[PDB]
Amino acid sequence: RNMFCVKPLDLNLDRHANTALVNAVNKLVYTGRLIMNVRRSWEELERKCLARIQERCKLLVKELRMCLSFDSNYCRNILKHAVENGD
């Protein structure tokens, strides 16, 4: 739900029960799950934003193409750039 400022945990893991190797691998798998989830969520938001902005730009340039004028053509030449890479 919120990528930017997630917090870690200690799982309230016990030491009396269970084998210690499973304790270590459980801590590790929690850490891996957290990092994978946060990175994947950031990537998903980036993908959705890029798709939406590309579609909006395409629709806008198609609409404005009909009004052939200097300022409008300048706007078109601005908008014609691709944005597949974030920079």
Binding site: H16, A17, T19, A20
Partner: protein
């Protein structure tokens, strides 16, 4: 000799007068002139070094074995052994047969070294003896 250290003169005298005696097969004997000397001090130094080494090399499981067994076993041997020791379930803290076997082999060597202090050279192995106990047939070794 070990007791002579860390003890006062009269405590040493009482302990010496006790240790001077021995009982063996319905017979008894007394040790002549067991005075503490630098020859025995060499033995004390090497024995205490070996004893501290066997103390350090001992693993967690070896140390905890006796205390764990006292929880639910009971016998005269066990009660005597526990009475000799000081007085103050759970999964074992660490399990590692390879490291454990290496440690216990090193402790085995150290125990051998500590034991050799008191073992004499085994000169004779004996066979059947005349019933009067005077003479016997033996094999010479060492």
């Amino acid at each position: 000799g070990l007791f002579s250290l860390d003890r006062s003169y009269e405590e040493v005298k009482a302990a010496v007068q006790q240790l001077q005696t021995i009982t063996f097969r319905d017979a008894t004997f007394t040790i002549p002139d067991p005075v503490i000397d630098q020859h025995l001090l060499i033995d004390m130094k090497t024995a205490c070094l070996s004893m501290s080494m066997v103390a350090n090399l001992a693993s967690e499981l070896t140390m905890t074995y006796v205390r764990k067994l006292a929880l639910e076993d009971s016998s005269m041997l066990l009660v005597k052994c526990q009475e000799l020791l000081m007085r103050l379930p759970a999964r074992p803290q660490h399990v590692s047969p390879d490291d454990e076997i290496a440690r216990l082999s090193a402790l085995f060597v150290m125990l051998r070294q500590l034991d050799d202090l008191i073992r004499e050279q085994v000169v004779f192995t004996v066979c059947d003896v005349s019933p009067d106990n005077k003479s016997a047939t033996c094999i010479f070794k060492g």
